[PDB]
Amino acid sequence: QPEPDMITIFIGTWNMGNAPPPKKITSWFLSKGQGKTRDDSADYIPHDIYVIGTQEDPLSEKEWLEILKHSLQEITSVTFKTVAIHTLWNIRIVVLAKPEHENRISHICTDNVKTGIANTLGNKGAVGVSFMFNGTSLGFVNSHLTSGSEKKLRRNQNYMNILRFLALGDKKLSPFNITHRFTHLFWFGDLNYRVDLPTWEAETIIQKIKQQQYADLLSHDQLLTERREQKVFLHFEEEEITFAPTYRFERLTRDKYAYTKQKATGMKYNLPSWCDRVLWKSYPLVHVVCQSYGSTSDIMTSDHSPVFATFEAGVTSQFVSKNGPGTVDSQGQIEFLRCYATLKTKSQTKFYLEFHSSCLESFVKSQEGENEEGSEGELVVKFGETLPKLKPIISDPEYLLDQHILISIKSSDSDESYGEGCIALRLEATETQLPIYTPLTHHGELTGHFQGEIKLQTSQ
């Protein structure tokens, strides 16, 4: 049985509004309703992995697992294996996989982050799962962020707290947060960003929704505007939204948006909004294609509609050669030329680089670079030709060209990372000097750039 080079992943996010689900929710897992929907001809075809995020979930883990497993069984005639389930308050993530994948899945991690302090430490935060699927690392984050049209800053703060403190993936990757630890990272949930238009425009917004004219609404979506100003979800992707706002509905119909301020809303308006979202961030030059992104029309127990997204995602095999794993393959090397980091830091201290990759027996520390002043005030850290020669465990190009090198630039004085980034080895050529580039972030904020040239030696 050959190892896959591609899998399909279903991502679901549903804020259940503290109500049990209806007897049939199969439309969700089939990507049927509004938006970018899945072809009817695929309905019997199971996804390889199903990742379900709920918010305001009133069910026990046992109650929800029974509904999810029985649902997928009715659709596919396959009995899914439970990879992981983690719940923080009423925020839950379930990962299910086809039985044929049981022995391809390992290194399963779960974690949660509680957001807010005293007042605001109450019910918001994130849960997450990570695991290895053969040679591919996969991360999944379900977050319920701060509610309310006037709290987009709080939501952006909740995001930064979750990405700093959610402990998933390989703990040996100590300089890197979740936004660098995974081949493919999926981040979804009730992110609670709103359509930022005047209250008096509520009926105009509803009219626009009824005509399926989303352009003037999405131009005021707080997640799109905050992302365009690099305030949140830097370097993440989202498929185009072509479905109606998923919040806030009257329960038991989809014919009506409930937007007016009530005691129950803290006297806040809930203008129709895309609260419920799926974003992803994959390593450079890895295959990832969104094949669906939409909302169900027929599940009406909550004041939110479930959202689905499906993805084709590139995966690699667990490679074994005569040499690595367990030693280096002297037929392989990675060299770096004319390299320099440009940093936004106003500080003047020495820096060195760390290289981390599963293609190396362990991480590699460089010599300190030489600091120079950029023409526009920047700190430029010059490595020139001084960066070490990296020694991969496997030289076969079918392995090495599918790998990535994570880079951290660290203070000599503190050993603290000032910026992290990622370089693909999927080069246009081997044994050839080629430009490389990565932005550098710290706590998911842009802190600089790394550029230079690479020269990759493989066994071919």
Ligand SMILES: CC(C)C(=O)Nc1cccc(C#N)c1
């Ligand atoms: C007890 C549960 C959470 C568990 O360990 N699940 C698991 C582990 C390894 C592979 C797969 C699959 N498929 C599932």
